[PDB]
């Protein structure tokens, strides 16, 4: 199916505590493969997936050099943003950046993105056409004008539509054994009596990959609303998720749980029986 490569950067100023924290992590789909942590000992881009360790020293030195360049740019950004918003030096602020590319089942470019946020909110981002910017407010307009005049988008687009996709293909290849896998969810249901007239049915999905999945409850062959928890990581490269529904004691049979996942040839339908 489709695949993606994404880099996530987090920068946090630390008032009166020196240099800002800088964390960068790279992902291929839902699998992290590298990381850089300003507070870690190596001060280098590090591998976080087996298939990426096969990359030579030229790769690691190049990624280390580039991630450090990102860190430096973000270090300046924090000061600049504080000024744009005329905020005091007393408070910590956050800069976040995300960029990468999506490819279809044919491993060909599908979409690109480069988004930037300040204090947990959209600040500026490339439009899906990768040729113009969308600035969230008045302060961000200044950045938009600077980047348009310097033709930033052009170089970013070149990356997002080509280089990004090339590396993604490469990674999907080198990590075929893990990245190009699909682990169907292992499912089951639990039943717990709330009161003497009510019972909650929980539908479980475990050990699946990728994280994408749909768990829907139905009472009499029709969608119904139900608690749904966020898909959570198991810690072994697979994910988990559950959906519960409160049902009148003695009506369990009416309810059915439906599971959709790319690892399931055909959707699953579970019932308390």
């Amino acid at each position: 199916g489709s695949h993606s490569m994404r880099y996530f950067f987090t920068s946090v100023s630390r008032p009166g505590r020196g240099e800002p924290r800088f964390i960068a992590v790279g992902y291929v789909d839902d699998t992290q493969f590298v990381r850089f942590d300003s507070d870690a000992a190596s001060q280098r881009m590090e591998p976080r997936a087996p298939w990426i360790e096969q990359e030579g020293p030229e790769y690691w030195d190049g990624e280390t050099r580039k991630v450090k360049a990102h860190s430096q740019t973000h270090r300046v950004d924090l000061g600049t943003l504080r000024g744009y918003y005329n905020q005091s030096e007393a408070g910590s602020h956050t800069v976040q950046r995300m960029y990468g590319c999506d490819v279809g089942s044919d491993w060909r470019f599908l979409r690109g993105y480069h988004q930037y946020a300040y204090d947990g909110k959209d600040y500026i981002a490339l439009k899906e056409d990768l040729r113009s910017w969308t600035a969230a407010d008045m302060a961000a307009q200044t950045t938009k004008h600077k980047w348009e005049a310097a033709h930033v988008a052009e170089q970013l687009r070149a990356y997002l539509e080509g280089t990004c996709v090339e590396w993604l293909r490469r990674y999907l290849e080198n990590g075929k054994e893990t990245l190009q896998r699909t682990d169907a969810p292992k499912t089951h249901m639990t039943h717990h009596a709330v009161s003497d007239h009510e019972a909650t049915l929980r539908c479980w999905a475990l050990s699946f990959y990728p994280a994408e999945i749909t768990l829907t409850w139905q009472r009499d062959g029709e969608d119904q609303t139900t608690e749904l928890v966020e898909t959570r990581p198991a810690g072994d490269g697979t994910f988990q998720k559950w959906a519960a529904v409160v049902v009148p004691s003695g009506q369990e049979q009416r309810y059915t749980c439906h599971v959709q996942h790319e690892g399931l040839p055909k959707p699953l339908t579970l019932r308390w029986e």
Partner: peptide, 9 residues
């Protein structure tokens, strides 16, 4: 692999 040409705001 990381990109380049990332300028300051």
């Amino acid at each position: 692999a990381l990109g380049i040409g990332i300028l300051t705001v």
